[PDB]
RNA sequence: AGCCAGGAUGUUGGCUUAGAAGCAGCCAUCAUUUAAAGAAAGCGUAAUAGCUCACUGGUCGAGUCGGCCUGCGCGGAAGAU
RNA sequence: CCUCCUAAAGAGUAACGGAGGAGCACGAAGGUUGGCUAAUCCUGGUCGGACAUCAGGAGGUUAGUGCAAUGGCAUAAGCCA
RNA sequence: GCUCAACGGAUAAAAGGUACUCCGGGGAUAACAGGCUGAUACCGCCCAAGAGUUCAUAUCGACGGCGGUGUUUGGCACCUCGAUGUCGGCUCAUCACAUCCUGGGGCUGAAGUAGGUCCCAAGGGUAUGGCUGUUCGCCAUUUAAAGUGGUACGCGAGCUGG
C-alpha cells in the first residue's frame, strides 16, 4: 500500500476506484501497484 | 554602507503655467538646461531660469525645426 | 543557470508583478508552455525545467527558453537584524505574468512535446499550460 | 614508473548521510546563552566521525564552521585510506 | 465558405466589451474601402470552432449582419492571454 | 465492453557481448503470406523457451469514446488543559 | 554641500534605501567680434606598426563640455583666431 | 584670520574605568518568558533524472516545485524595568502524536528466523551507572523499549545552587 497525495494508474491492469470517499488504485496483476490517497 | 547621501531638492519646474498673468520679472520656469526656451518677451537667466521681460500672460508653444518648447509672454 | 553577463546596476527594487504578459504567442517553435499563473521563475528553476524537457525530447528537436532571469533578488544573511543597508544578491528571477510563453519547442511529435512540457511544468512554481502555433 | 592518474573531484557529502545535533554551550555566561542552542555537532552516519563547533554566537555560523571541519576530516580520512593501501602495495613490493 | 452571423453593436467601450465577453459573445470590427467601419458582436463559441481551422484566415468569409452578406477576410485576431478564447477580431472587406 | 479464434515468414536482422534469439544495449525499423500479425508495448529467461499485448476475423445488437470550456464538491490536511 | 533614482507625470517627500561626486579650477578655460563642426570605420599612402601625421569616402554628434551625475547645448553652451 | 568637517558653529582650551558604585527615569529600549512572523529548523507531499543485475516509485531518490508545525537559530520590540528569579539536578507531573516497546494491518528486493518501509493505534509501559555543573554527548552493562515534543525549553511562595 503506497499512500500518496497523487495516485495514478501505473499499468493497464491498475484501476482507480473510490471507496468510502477515498481514491484508490487497485491492481489485479501487481500487488506493488495498489495505492491510496492520504 | 557607502550610500546614505543625497542633495537638497532644488524646487525647480514651471512656476507660472499657460494663461497665467504675470508681472515683469516674474520667474516662469526654473530649469537645469534649456528644457524650455525663451520666446517673445521672456528672458533667460544665467542658470537658464526663464522670466517675464513684460507684464502679460504666459504662452507655452512648440516652435522651430527642432520642435522645442518656447515660452512667450502675450500682452493683455 | 541563466544570468545577465553585465549589469547596469548590481541590486534592484522589489517592484510589483501585476498585468498580463507580452511574449504571449508561440513565435519560434511549434509548441509552447504558456504560464497561466502569476509568479517569478528563478534561474535555477528555469534550468531545471530545461533539463527535464531536453531529456524527455532525447536531444531531438529544438528548444527555446523565451524567459530570462534578469532581475536580481537580494537576501539578507541569517541572524542579521533589519537595518544596515540592502542584502546581497543571491539569485536571479524572471518575473512571470499570466500569458507568458516560457518555453518553445519544434522538431517533435505533438504528444511527445506535451509530455515533455508536463515534465517541465512540475519543476516550475507557476501553473502552466500547453499551447500551439497559431496562424495569426 | 607510475601513471598520471586523473585527480578525482572531492565529492560533496549528502545531508542524508549526516546527523546535525544542536545544543547548549559549556560555561556559556549570561541569560541568553543559557537558553540559546548555538553549539553544533555534525556526525557522519556511514563512518562515525563527529565535528563539534561552538565558537560563534550564531548557530548558523557554527554549523558552517562545523561543516567545513567535517569536510576537512573526511578529506583527511580519504587521504589516510589512500596511504594505507599504498603502504600495503610497497610492503608487497618489498617482499620481493 | 464560412458563414458567420453578427449583430450591430449598440454600446461600445470597455465595460460593454467585458459584458459581451461575459455573455459568451465577443466584439469585432469590419473595415476597408470607401465604406465606414462597422462594429459587430459575434457568438464566441461558434467562431472559436471556425478559427480552429487554418482555412479560416486564408479564405474569404461572409459575415451576415442585418440580412446583409458582407464578404471579408480575417485581418488580426486578439486572443485572451491564457485561455482558448477570442478578445476581438479585425475584418477587412475583400 | 465482454466473449471465441489467429497473433506468422526471411528471422534468432546484425553486432558487442560472457550470452543477447521482439525485450542488456547500439542501430536499421524493411519487405513477405495478407483477414491481420511491431525486426515488437508489457511479463518472463542463464539465454532460448514460455505467458500476454498491438492490429484483425467471428459472436453480440445500441449508443459509445476522450479532450475542451465552466459551476459546485473530494483527497492532499498531524500538536500539545 | 551637489547629481540621479526611491518620489506615486506641479513643488516637496523617509529609511544604517540603491548609485555616484565636491571642499575646486581658470587673468583665460573670462568678454566680445570673426570663422569652424564631432566619434568611429573602410580604402589608398615613406619610415609607420591595432593605434601618430596626410588624403578621400561612409558616417551623422554615437563626439565634445576643465571634473560626478542629470538636464542642456549647431543660433551651438563644442573648436580655432 | 576657523577639515569651528559632530559643517546653525555649546569653551580659546578636554581620554578613559567602575563588578565598589549611586540617583532620577524608561518596558519610549536590550537580556528571560509570552506575542506576531516562520527566512532558518523540523516534519510531510509533487515531479521523476537515475541507483537498485533486469526494473524510476521493495528501498533510495538528483535537478527542481508545493505545504504543515511552531519546533531550533532567528526577525520584530506588542506585554513586563514602582522585579515576570536564570541552566542543570531532584520531587511531582500532565497533555500531543509526528509511536520507541507492546496490539492490528498493506507492500516488500517478505522462504523461515530476522528485517525494511508505509497505514492504523496514545491503553499501558518506556534503564542503571562512569565522565562532565551540564542539557547534550561518548562509553560500560542492561531492556520488550530505553520515543520525539508541548506544558514561562512544565515545576525555586516545592527542594538544591554544581
Ligand atoms: Mg511589461
Ligand atoms: Mg472599470
Ligand atoms: Mg480542499
Ligand atoms: Mg515630484
Ligand atoms: Mg505627484
Ligand atoms: Mg560665436
Ligand atoms: Mg565661451
Ligand atoms: Mg552639531
Ligand atoms: Mg548640525
Ligand atoms: Mg564588568
Ligand atoms: Mg535606579
Ligand atoms: Mg524575547
Ligand atoms: Mg508577558
Ligand atoms: Mg503560521
Ligand atoms: Mg530534493
Ligand atoms: Mg515595547
Ligand atoms: Mg514601532
Ligand atoms: Mg523588567
Ligand atoms: Mg507591581
Ligand atoms: Mg499516527
Ligand atoms: Mg510490517
Ligand atoms: Mg478499554
Ligand atoms: Mg568513583
Ligand atoms: Mg524552565
Ligand atoms: Mg530551577
Ligand atoms: Mg525556598
Ligand atoms: Mg509564583
Ligand atoms: Mg555557585
Ligand atoms: Zn498495476
- Which chain D positions have a beta carbon within 8 Å of C79's beta carbon? 58-61
Give domain limits for chain C. 21-136
- Split into its structural domains, chain B has a count of 1
* Cell reading at C111: 504528444
Query: What is the layout of strands, in order, in the sheet containing A35-37?
Result: A2-4, A35-37, A23-27, A14-18
Please give the Cα distance from C9 to C74 (Å, whole number). Answer: 13
Contact between E41 and E11 under an 8 Å Cβ cutoff? The reply is no
Paired sense of beta strands E61-65 and E3-8, if any: parallel
Task: Decide which of 3.90.25.10, 3.40.50.300, 3.90.1170.10, 2.40.10.340 is the CATH code for C21-136.
Answer: 3.90.1170.10
B6 in a structural domain = no
Mark out chain E residues that contact chain C at CB-CB < 8 A: 54, 57-58, 74, 76-77, 79, 81-82
User: Please, what is the end-to-end C-alpha distance for chain E in angstroms?
Assistant: 14
- Burial annotation E51-84 (CB, 10 A radius, 16+ → b, else e): beeeebbeeebebebeeeebebbbbebebebbee
Q: Å between B64 CA and G57 C1'?
A: 32
Name the DSSP class of D45: T
Longest Cα–Cα distance in chain E: 37
Please give the Cα distance from A22 to A17 (Å, whole number). Answer: 8
B18 in a structural domain = yes
Residue D56: which of D70, D73, D39, D69 has the closest Cα? D39
CATH topology of domain D13-75: Double Stranded RNA Binding Domain (3.30.160)
* Cell reading at A4: 500518496
Q: How far is CA D9 from the centre of its chain?
A: 17
What is the resolution in angstroms?
3.2
Please give the Cα distance from D59 to D37 (Å, whole number). Answer: 7
Please give the Cα distance from A14 to A26 (Å, whole number). Answer: 6
- State the method: cryo-EM
* DSSP codes, chain B: ------PPP---EESS-TT-EE-TT-EEEE-SSSSEEE-TTEEE-TTS-EEESSSEEEEEEEETTTTEEEEEEE--
Mutate to test the interface with E, among C32, C98, C135 (most CBs of E within 10 A): C135
* Cell reading at C29: 517553435
* Cell reading at C103: 518555453
Domains and CATH numbers, chain E: 1-94 (2.40.240.10)
Please give the Cα distance from C109 to B55 (Å, whole number). Answer: 79
Please give the Cα distance from B46 to B41 (Å, whole number). Answer: 17
Which residues are registered as beta bridge partners of C65? C103
Residue B18 sits in which domain range? 12-76
Quick one: D71 exposed, middle or buried, by C-beta within 10 A (0-12, 13-18, 19+)? Answer: middle
Which residues are registered as beta bridge partners of E7? E41
Amino acid at each position: 500500500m503506497k499512500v500518496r497525495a497523487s495516485v495514478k494508474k501505473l499499468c493497464r491492469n491498475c484501476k482507480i476506484v473510490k471507496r468510502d470517499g477515498v481514491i484508490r488504485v487497485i491492481c489485479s496483476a501487481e500487488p506493488k501497484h495498489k495505492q491510496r490517497q492520504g | 554602507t557607502r550610500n546614505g547621501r543625497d542633495s537638497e531638492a532644488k524646487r525647480l519646474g514651471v512656476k507660472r503655467f499657460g494663461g497665467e498673468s504675470v508681472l515683469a520679472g516674474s520667474i516662469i520656469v526654473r530649469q537645469r538646461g534649456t528644457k524650455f526656451h525663451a520666446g517673445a518677451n521672456v528672458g533667460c537667466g544665467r542658470d537658464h531660469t526663464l522670466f517675464a521681460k513684460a507684464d502679460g500672460k504666459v504662452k507655452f508653444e512648440v516652435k522651430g525645426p527642432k520642435n522645442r518648447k518656447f515660452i512667450s509672454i502675450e500682452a493683455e | 543557470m541563466l544570468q545577465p553577463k553585465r549589469t547596469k546596476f548590481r541590486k534592484m527594487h522589489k517592484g510589483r508583478n501585476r498585468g498580463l504578459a507580452q511574449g504571449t504567442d508561440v513565435s519560434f517553435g511549434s509548441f509552447g508552455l504558456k504560464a497561466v499563473g502569476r509568479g517569478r521563475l528563478t534561474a535555477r528553476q528555469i534550468e531545471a525545467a530545461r533539463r527535464a524537457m531536453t531529456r524527455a525530447v532525447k536531444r531531438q528537436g529544438k528548444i527555446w527558453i523565451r524567459v530570462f532571469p534578469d532581475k536580481p533578488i537580494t537576501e539578507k544573511p541569517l541572524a542579521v537584524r533589519m537595518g544596515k543597508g540592502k542584502g546581497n544578491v543571491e539569485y536571479w528571477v524572471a518575473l512571470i505574468q499570466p500569458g507568458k510563453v516560457l518555453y518553445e519547442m519544434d522538431g517533435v511529435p505533438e504528444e511527445l512535446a506535451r509530455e515533455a512540457f508536463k515534465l517541465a511544468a512540475a519543476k516550475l512554481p507557476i501553473k502552466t499550460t500547453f499551447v500551439t502555433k497559431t496562424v495569426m | 614508473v607510475y601513471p598520471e592518474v586523473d585527480d578525482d573531484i572531492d565529492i560533496e557529502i549528502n545531508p542524508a548521510d549526516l546527523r546535525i545535533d544542536v545544543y547548549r554551550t559549556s560555561g556559556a555566561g549570561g541569560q541568553h546563552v543559557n537558553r540559546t542552542e548555538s553549539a553544533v555537532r555534525i556526525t557522519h552516519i556511514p563512518t562515525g566521525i563527529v565535528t563539534q563547533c561552538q565558537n560563534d554566537r550564531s548557530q548558523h555560523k557554527n554549523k558552517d564552521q562545523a561543516m567545513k571541519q567535517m569536510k576537512a576530516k573526511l578529506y583527511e580520512l580519504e587521504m589516510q585510506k589512500k596511504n594505507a593501501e599504498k603502504q600495503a602495495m610497497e610492503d608487497n613490493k618489498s617482499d620481493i | 465558405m464560412f458563414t458567420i452571423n453578427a449583430e450591430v453593436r449598440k454600446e461600445q467601450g470597455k465595460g460593454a466589451s467585458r459584458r459581451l465577453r461575459a455573455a459568451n459573445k465577443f466584439p469585432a470590427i469590419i473595415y476597408g474601402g470607401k465604406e465606414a467601419p462597422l462594429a459587430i458582436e459575434l457568438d464566441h463559441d461558434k467562431v472559436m470552432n471556425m478559427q480552429a481551422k487554418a482555412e479560416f484566415y486564408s479564405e474569404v468569409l461572409t459575415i451576415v449582419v442585418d440580412g446583409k452578406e458582407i464578404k471579408v477576410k480575417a485581418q488580426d485576431v486578439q486572443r485572451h492571454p491564457y485561455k482558448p478564447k477570442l478578445q476581438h477580431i479585425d475584418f477587412v472587406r475583400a
